[PDB]
Design an enzyme around this catalytic site. Sequence first.
Site, mmCIF file in Angstrom:
data_model
loop_
_atom_site.group_PDB
_atom_site.id
_atom_site.type_symbol
_atom_site.label_atom_id
_atom_site.label_comp_id
_atom_site.label_asym_id
_atom_site.label_seq_id
_atom_site.Cartn_x
_atom_site.Cartn_y
_atom_site.Cartn_z
ATOM 1 N N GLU A 35 1.664 40.357 84.829
ATOM 2 C CA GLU A 35 2.513 40.591 83.452
ATOM 3 C C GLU A 35 2.189 39.727 82.611
ATOM 4 O OE1 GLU A 35 2.732 43.825 82.836
ATOM 5 O OE2 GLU A 35 2.784 44.785 84.899
ATOM 6 N N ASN A 46 3.832 47.157 71.207
ATOM 7 C CA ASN A 46 2.630 47.971 71.562
ATOM 8 C C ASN A 46 2.414 49.140 69.763
ATOM 9 O OD1 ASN A 46 2.473 47.234 74.733
ATOM 10 N ND2 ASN A 46 4.430 47.795 74.469
ATOM 11 N N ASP A 49 2.920 52.911 70.438
ATOM 12 C CA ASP A 49 4.073 53.731 70.265
ATOM 13 C C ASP A 49 5.552 53.375 69.957
ATOM 14 O OD1 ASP A 49 4.446 51.538 72.549
ATOM 15 O OD2 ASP A 49 5.409 53.699 73.652
ATOM 16 N N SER A 51 6.652 50.612 71.355
ATOM 17 C CA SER A 51 8.333 50.132 72.166
ATOM 18 C C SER A 51 7.599 48.611 71.840
ATOM 19 C CB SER A 51 7.735 50.861 72.880
ATOM 20 O OG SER A 51 6.599 50.764 73.917
ATOM 21 N N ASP A 53 7.451 45.666 75.398
ATOM 22 C CA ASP A 53 7.672 45.271 76.296
ATOM 23 C C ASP A 53 8.029 43.724 76.894
ATOM 24 O OD1 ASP A 53 6.049 47.288 77.309
ATOM 25 O OD2 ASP A 53 4.095 45.956 77.063
ATOM 26 N N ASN A 60 9.852 47.888 79.981
ATOM 27 C CA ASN A 60 9.232 48.377 78.193
ATOM 28 C C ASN A 60 10.660 48.930 78.074
ATOM 29 O OD1 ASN A 60 8.936 51.227 77.169
ATOM 30 N ND2 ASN A 60 7.273 50.019 76.746
#
Length: 130
Positions: A35, A46, A49, A51, A53, A60
Amino acid sequence: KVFERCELARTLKRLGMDGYRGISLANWMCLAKWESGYNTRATNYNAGDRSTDYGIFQINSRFWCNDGKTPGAVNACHLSCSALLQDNIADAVACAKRVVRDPQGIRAWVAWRNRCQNRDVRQYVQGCGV
């Protein structure tokens, strides 16, 4: 901060992650590896959408932490997303335990399915004395 591998393994161990909801430490280590490269300041936006992370586990902002700018944010960890960019990972760990109490468990992170599920992951903890 960027953790060294065994350094992170002992920290996660101390914070109660080994066998948490049946998940071995080696699986948690494989997840942080892919990750963020064990980097607590990692962020990924992102665009599709809206959002982001956050942190070592790339948690998220739509479901778990609140950053104020994500549409439909639920904030299930009841945490500011800035708490996941600290050098101290105790908050990231408490939110990661919250994510896996959902039925999906660690499968909630796609990267664990791609790079860790059904693989030998024992090399992530070897030699750490954990």
